[PDB]
Amino acid sequence: SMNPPPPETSNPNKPKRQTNQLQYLLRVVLKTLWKHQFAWPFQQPVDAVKLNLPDYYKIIKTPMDMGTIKKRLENNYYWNAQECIQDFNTMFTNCYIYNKPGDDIVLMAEALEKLFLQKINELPTEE
Ligand SMILES: Cc1noc(C)c1-c1ccc2c(Nc3ccccc3C(C)(C)C)c(C(=O)O)cnc2c1
């Protein structure tokens, strides 16, 4: 079968912005997660074809991954921090929805989410 197009990382019709919170999300949160031992399966869109997961995009209709988030941050795609936090949450929830609770990928996601929550706990006040 085929993969869907990936989520957009830029859009001329979407207002763009940089805030200190978004700067923190790229510099501190994304960077910390990106270098984690278990980050790699989350660093790009799920390739359902090459991973032989024909039902993935039948079940997951709002895909998200850290590669997309990284690019969105780099492109000033977001208007605010909440949009970016929502993308992280979508990434984690998708993983928990599609996979079985005791699967390795779920434990990998759980480790990353714990670290994510630790880092966004110190999200600075907006300036
Ligand atoms: C993230 C994510 N969310 O749902 C799924 C499904 C994934 C996912 C899972 C595995 C990936 C993967 N490797 C792979 C393939 C089959 C079984 C087990 C794995 C492990 C646990 C080793 C990662 C790769 C890869 O092998 O490159 C890429 N993306 C994946 C996404």
Side-chain angles (χ1 to χ4, degrees), residues 39-127:
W40 62 273
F42 305 88
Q43 283 178 338
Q44 58 286 309
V46 171
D47 188 335
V49 180
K50 287 186 174 176
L51 299 173
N52 199 32
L53 303 171
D55 68 336
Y56 183 82
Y57 290 111
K58 300 180 193 291
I59 294 162
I60 299 303
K61 297 300 189 192
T62 313
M64 189 51 56
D65 65 279
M66 291 204 300
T68 296
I69 294 166
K70 183 171 182 282
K71 288 296 192 193
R72 284 179 172 194
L73 288 163
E74 290 168 352
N75 295 346
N76 295 323
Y77 177 83
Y78 301 115
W79 188 258
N80 65 38
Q82 182 54 211
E83 289 177 275
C84 178
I85 291 164
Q86 178 197 311
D87 282 348
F88 276 104
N89 287 334
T90 294
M91 181 183 74
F92 292 125
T93 305
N94 286 345
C95 187
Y96 306 142
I97 287 168
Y98 181 76
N99 300 285
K100 305 286 169 282
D103 284 0
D104 282 349
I105 193 66
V106 174
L107 287 179
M108 291 172 85
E110 282 178 357
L112 292 165
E113 191 189 4
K114 188 191 174 186
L115 184 50
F116 170 71
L117 290 173
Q118 286 166 341
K119 291 295 184 187
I120 67 165
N121 190 53
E122 300 205 48
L123 186 74
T125 307
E126 189 171 0
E127 296 293 319

Side-chain angles (χ1 to χ4, degrees), residues 28-45:
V28 177
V29 183
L30 188 279
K31 280 199 191 298
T32 292
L33 291 162
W34 193 268
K35 300 293 184 174
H36 194 263
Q37 180 182 359
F38 304 148
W40 62 273
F42 305 88
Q43 283 178 338
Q44 58 286 309

